[PDB]
Write a protein that binds this ligand. Structure first.
Ligand SMILES: Nc1nc2c(ncn2[C@@H]2O[C@H](COP(=O)(O)OP(=O)(O)O)[C@@H](O)[C@H]2O)c(=O)[nH]1
Ligand SMILES: *CC(=O)N(C)CCN(C)c1ccc([N+](=O)[O-])c2nonc12
Ligand SMILES: [Mg+2]
Length: 166
């Protein structure tokens, strides 16, 4: 079956695992082992195509992992995630993208910028700010909540659409 290899990167606590697990298990986790990193597979129909998403949910851990290296190199699309109530997480984004540009040796990597925790009445990073970080990158911005699923399918499926047209 057609597959897409997706990688989810971003600062600690942005909700990378929560997003993954909403897409896959259709529920919210109120917390998660902050340190665990693996890939999960998920069947979805996207734009009418039956396919599998193989999603490495990264952790922040003191580098080297061969598995992590393998996904950073053969991964077709990256979700770059910050939380909209955490300005440091948003500032970090450029480190994550830059590491992806290095491992993929390209300025044109299927990516999507995700502002998670859109449910919160806690916003510190304004939407237009992220629109502009994304536009400058030439990639889409999408705001999500793992708590309510708003934007989640859209984050992932826009990423697939970016992998396809690459
Ligand atoms: N309100 C809210 N909390 C979230 C959301 N996503 C994650 N969280 C919380 O943020 C914390 C970090 O989540 P986690 O998935 O471990 O983040 P990770 O370190 O990026 O994998 C946990 O307490 C989650 O319950 C979200 O969309 N909304
Ligand atoms: C942060 C955390 O609680 N974990 C990494 C525990 C295991 N999780 C989140 C997990 C395990 C297995 C599968 N799976 O088989 O597909 C998951 N899919 O989303 N989260 C999964
Ligand atoms: Mg995690």
């Amino acid at each position: 079956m057609t597959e897409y290899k997706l990688v989810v990167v971003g600062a600690g606590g942005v909700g990378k695992s929560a997003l993954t697990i909403q897409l896959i298990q259709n529920h919210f986790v109120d917390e998660c082992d902050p340190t665990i990193e693996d890939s999960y597979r998920k069947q979805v129909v996207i734009d009418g195509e039956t396919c599998l998403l193989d999603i490495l949910d990264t952790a922040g851990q003191e580098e080297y992992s061969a598995m992590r290296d393998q996904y950073m190199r053969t991964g077709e699309g990256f979700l770059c995630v910050f939380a909209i109530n955490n300005t440091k997480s948003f500032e970090d984004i450029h480190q994550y993208r830059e590491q992806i540009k290095r491992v993929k040796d390209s300025d044109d990597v299927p990516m999507v910028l995700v502002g998670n925790k859109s449910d919160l009445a806690a916003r510190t990073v304004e939407s237009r700010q992220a629109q502009d970080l994304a536009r400058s990158y030439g990639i889409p911005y999408i705001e999500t909540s793992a708590k309510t699923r708003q934007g989640v399918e859209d984050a992932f499926y826009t990423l697939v659409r970016e992998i396809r047209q690459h």
